[PDB]
């Protein structure tokens, strides 16, 4: 076969150990999930780090401790549509319950008359997105190092019946050791089987989402294919100026690859970017192991990635606490808190 006796035995033992880890991880998650901490004037607001549908993420400094954090601010009155509301409650509840080396750590959450707030560990190395756009494309070893972290993170999340649903370089922060921290759980959801919301980012949507079919955690494995392609090419596989054109390319079942992609990479990507769910890697009887045991990952020491023992492709420059040099600049808008409580009943559980 492809493996000798000793290699095969090592892999099987490795798989029993994964099972053991995931069983303990589920016990720990469920305790926090069933039983889900600060105030706005406890922080100085420093700089906007990014902006989105409902608000912004700011660097903030905790006044008493001096620790820096990323604060996501959501304007309750912008969170108006039904699935925008439910998604915000998903995000907070999931973030407070998970624990994994490549997932950002939530430290505080609170609300006031106008806004919802989630305060997370600050990751100063910047978004994968801007490093990727600046350099053009990552080498295959570099892309593989980041991809391995996403594979392990999705194996963790999926074992908890969590779907992530917004993988993209914008959502992947690089920490001081050069490893990934996934942020933004605004589209994540606990799903036992299928779910039906039409949501995500156009370039990263699986065909079954676009086609209004009930879908499952395999949409994350499709998105991994898009991510790996974009990291290694510098642009995603379904690339057009308008969402409707992107959707048409996704559904077609066609993908073209740069001539510099290795054949191992193309093989992996054809099996992730697979429109037929009975054939998509991650979704078959051997689950995530079809991905982890693929030839493109043959040099990957999965346990060593998890333990953060592997040397990273690069280490972001950092000048000290609160350095924002690895982030782009955004227009600053003052945080106004109304004297009247807004949308109190829609956000009771937050």
């Amino acid at each position: 076969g492809h493996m000798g006796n000793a290699a095969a035995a090592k892999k099987g033992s490795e798989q029993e150990s994964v099972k053991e880890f995931l069983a303990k991880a589920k016990e720990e998650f469920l305790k926090k999930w069933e039983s889900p901490t600060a105030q706005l004037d406890h922080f100085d607001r420093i700089k906007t780090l990014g902006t989105g549908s409902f608000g912004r993420v700011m660097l903030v400094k905790h006044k008493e401790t001096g620790n820096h954090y990323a604060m996501k601010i959501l304007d309750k009155q912008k969170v108006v549509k039904l699935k925008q509301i439910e998604h915000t409650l998903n995000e907070k509840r999931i973030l407070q319950a998970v624990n994994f080396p490549f997932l950002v750590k939530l430290e505080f959450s609170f609300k006031d008359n106008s806004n919802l707030y989630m305060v997370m560990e600050y990751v100063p190395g910047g978004e994968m997105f801007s490093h990727l756009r600046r350099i053009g494309r990552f080498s295959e070893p570099h892309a593989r190092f980041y991809a391995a972290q996403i594979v392990l993170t999705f194996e963790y999340l999926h074992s908890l019946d969590l779907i992530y649903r917004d993988l993209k370089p914008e959502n992947l922060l690089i920490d001081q050791q050069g490893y990934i921290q996934v942020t933004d759980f605004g589209f994540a959801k606990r799903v036992k089987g299928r779910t039906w919301t039409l949501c995500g980012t156009p370039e990263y949507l699986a065909p079954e989402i676009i086609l209004s079919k009930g879908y499952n955690k395999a949409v994350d494995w499709w998105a991994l294919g898009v991510l790996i392609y974009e990291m290694a090419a510098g642009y995603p596989p379904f690339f057009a100026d308008q969402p409707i054109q992107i959707y048409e390319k996704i559904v077609s079942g066609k993908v073209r690859f740069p001539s510099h992609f290795s054949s191992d990479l193309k093989d992996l990507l054809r099996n992730l970017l697979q429109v037929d769910l009975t054939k998509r890697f991650g979704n078959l009887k051997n689950g995530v192991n079809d991905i982890k045991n693929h030839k493109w990952f043959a040099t990957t020491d999965w346990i060593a990635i998890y333990q953060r023992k592997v040397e990273a492709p690069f280490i972001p420059k950092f000048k000290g606490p609160g350095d924002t040099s690895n982030f782009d600049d955004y227009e600053e808008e003052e945080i106004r808190v109304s004297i009247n409580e807004k949308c109190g009943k829609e956000f009771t559980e937050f």
Partner: peptide, 13 residues
């Protein structure tokens, strides 16, 4: 030709 800037996720297409 395609989108090169940051991409917004859509909560309800």
């Amino acid at each position: 030709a395609g989108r090169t800037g940051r991409r917004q996720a859509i909560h309800d297409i």
